[PDB]
Amino acid sequence: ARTVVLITGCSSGIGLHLAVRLASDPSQSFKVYATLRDLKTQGRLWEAARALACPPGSLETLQLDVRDSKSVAAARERVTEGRVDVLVCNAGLGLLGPLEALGEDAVASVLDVNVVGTVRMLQAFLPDMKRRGSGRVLVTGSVGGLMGLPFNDVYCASKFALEGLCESLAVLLLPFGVHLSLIECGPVHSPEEVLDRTDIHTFHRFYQYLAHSKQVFREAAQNPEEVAEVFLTALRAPKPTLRYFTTERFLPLLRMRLDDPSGSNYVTAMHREVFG
Amino acid sequence: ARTVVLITGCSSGIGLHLAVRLASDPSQSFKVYATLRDLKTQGRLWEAARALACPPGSLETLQLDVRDSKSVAAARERVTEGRVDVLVCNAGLGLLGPLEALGEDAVASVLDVNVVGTVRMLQAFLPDMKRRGSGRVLVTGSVGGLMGLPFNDVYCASKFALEGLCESLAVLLLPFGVHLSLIECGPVHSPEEVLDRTDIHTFHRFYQYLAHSKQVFREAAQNPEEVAEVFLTALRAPKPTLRYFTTERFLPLLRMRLDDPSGSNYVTAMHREVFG
Ligand SMILES: C[C@]12CC[C@H]3[C@@H](CC=C4C[C@@H](O)CC[C@@]43C)[C@@H]1CC[C@@H]2O
Numbered sequence: 062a063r064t065v066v067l068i069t070g071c072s073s074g075i076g077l078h079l080a081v082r083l084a085s086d087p088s089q090s091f092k093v094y095a096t097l098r099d100l101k102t103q104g105r106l107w108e109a110a111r112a113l114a115c116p117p118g119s120l121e122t123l124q125l126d127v128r129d130s131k132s133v134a135a136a137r138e139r140v141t142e143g144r145v146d147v148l149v150c151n152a153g154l155g156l157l158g159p160l161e162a163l164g165e166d167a168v169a170s171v172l173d174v175n176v177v178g179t180v181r182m183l184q185a186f187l188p189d190m191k192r193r194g195s196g197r198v199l200v201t202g203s204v205g206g207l208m209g210l211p212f213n214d215v216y217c218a219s220k221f222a223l224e225g226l227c228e229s230l231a232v233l234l235l236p237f238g239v240h241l242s243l244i245e246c247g248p249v250h251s252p253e254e255v256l257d258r259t260d261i262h263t264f265h266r267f268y269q270y271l272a273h274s275k276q277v278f279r280e281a282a283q284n285p286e287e288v289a290e291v292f293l294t295a296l297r298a299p300k301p302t303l304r305y306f307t308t309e310r311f312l313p314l315l316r317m318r319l320d321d322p323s324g325s326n327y328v329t330a331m332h333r334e335v336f337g
Numbered sequence: 338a339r340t341v342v343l344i345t346g347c348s349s350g351i352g353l354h355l356a357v358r359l360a361s362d363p364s365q366s367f368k369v370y371a372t373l374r375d376l377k378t379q380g381r382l383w384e385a386a387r388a389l390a391c392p393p394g395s396l397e398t399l400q401l402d403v404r405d406s407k408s409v410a411a412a413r414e415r416v417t418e419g420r421v422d423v424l425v426c427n428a429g430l431g432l433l434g435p436l437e438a439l440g441e442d443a444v445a446s447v448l449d450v451n452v453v454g455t456v457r458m459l460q461a462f463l464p465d466m467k468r469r470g471s472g473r474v475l476v477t478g479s480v481g482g483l484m485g486l487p488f489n490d491v492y493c494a495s496k497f498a499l500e501g502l503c504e505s506l507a508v509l510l511l512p513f514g515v516h517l518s519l520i521e522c523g524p525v526h527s528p529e530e531v532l533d534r535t536d537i538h539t540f541h542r543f544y545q546y547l548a549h550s551k552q553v554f555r556e557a558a559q560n561p562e563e564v565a566e567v568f569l570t571a572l573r574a575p576k577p578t579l580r581y582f583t584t585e586r587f588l589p590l591l592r593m594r595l596d597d598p599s600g601s602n603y604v605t606a607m608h609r610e611v612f613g
Pocket residue numbers: 203204205210211213247248249273274277278334335
């Protein structure tokens with residue numbers, strides 16, 4: 062009767078703010094399964110549920126570790142209503158660093174959670190929406206998935222993954238009535254050891270990089286309430302595009318990339334942009 | 338004295354054709370470590386070495402499984418010359434199929450080999466080139482890494498990975514004197530069970546898809562000798578761009594993607610292109 066939305070990565074951030082945005086929706090039109098990797102981190106989801114008075118039962122938490130498709134099954138399974146109208150693949154790890162300084166493990170995890178996690182979700186939830194010929198899938202994307210960001214190699218590698226993965230799928234899903242969208246956000250409100258794992262020139266660059274992106278964060282970070290609302294623009298659109306941008310800020314920079322397919326104007330721009 | 342080139346995925350295909358292209362180079366200017374996942378599949382590399390008369394010692398095979406960074410170390414280690422001038426990350430798995438029909442394992446492997454493999458390589462080989470301020474890294478890319486291809490979701494997911502990964506890196510490597518390039522190729526010279534793992538409409542689409550791409554392959558596949566030669570255009574360029582295209586064929590289609598950042602013109606085009 063109500064629209065059933067299942068969302069991953071709800072402990073904090075986009076997923077949190079979105080989950081309680083949907084649950085407290087005044088029309089009371091949404092049933093929200095907020096998922097989290099561990100139930101113990103559900104403190105902020107509930108505090109924030111209370112504060113926006115979500116009615117009882119507009120909001121349920123499940124454990125869902127996307128690294129593990131037996132968790133994925135056990136949570137599809139807890140879906141009382143036996144369907145999911147709206148699936149929001151939000152779970153995401155970042156990773157910041159000189160590439161030599163990253164552990165092989167962390168690199169593996171970021172791709173497992175971000176890319177393979179999302180693959181597991183879809184495999185679990187797609188087939189049901191496909192039969193039924195209705196379903197909305199929304200995927201938190203990033204500007205890092207649209208253009209390469211120094212020191213965010215693997216992060217970007219995993220964000221691009223999702224562009225390609227979603228692009229491919231969408232060309233197949235066109236006339237199924239099943240709708241997929243990426244929601245592209247820009248930013249959103251120990252040194253010694255990195256020094257161990259690399260040279261001094263890189264490290265100095267890393268420092269330069271962080272001081273730069275401190276600035277952009279302060280001057281350009283959005284409210285997740287502003288971000289969150291872009292997913293309901295998408296989930297209510299009668300004919301949704303494959304892609305939504307939370308901001309136009311990075312559109313001039315993306316275009317430069319898009320008009321120089323050799324990649325190297327964009328390489329120049331982004332270099333001066335971050336190392337002055 | 339000679340230029341030392343190390344190349345992964347040499348059993349067949351691009352890596353093979355390239356390895357013996359470099360080794361038989363008439364000027365005799367290259368020393369080629371051809372790597373393969375298993376030494377037992379080295380038959381075609383050698384047959385083809387003989388046929389292009391590579392001199393003795395212009396060509397050496399090592400075992401290099403990129404899923405495993407102890408193999409990676411043990412093969413850096415077999416580099417007699419103690420340096421690598423030119424590193425070519427060529428290893429690649431494809432995966433074709435309805436996404437529900439792929440095993441979670443295969444999905445994991447494709448990303449491990451294609452994306453994480455390449456991450457391992459760089460971590461092993463980058464730092465040395467960075468100190469030295471010289472080094473050429475070349476990465477076999479694909480058109481699947483530039484635009485989403487139905488039924489190649491994970492393939493694409495892994496090819497986009499590499500765009501982002503290489504893009505990020507290149508913005509950092511600009512003034513190190515270390516050069517990274519992607520080499521973008523287009524194509525290059527059991528039903529029952531897929532039917533088990535999915536619906537009938539998808540399967541019919543898969544059939545439509547394969548019949549289409551049969552055609553494009555026949556009408557558009559390049560010689561790997563034509564492809565192979567594009568890597569030496571890159572490895573000899575005094576100032577290399579981040580990206581080389583083996584063909585212009587798919588450039589009109591990429592532009593449409595690039596001028597419609599909502600993704601959805603491209604979604605329309607590629608749909609009519611493959612399902613008529
Ligand atoms: C790289 C920049 C700083 C870091 C920024 C980036 C824009 C987008 C993101 C993604 C977000 O996850 C955190 C900030 C981060 C990583 C910026 C674009 C221009 C600026 O130089």
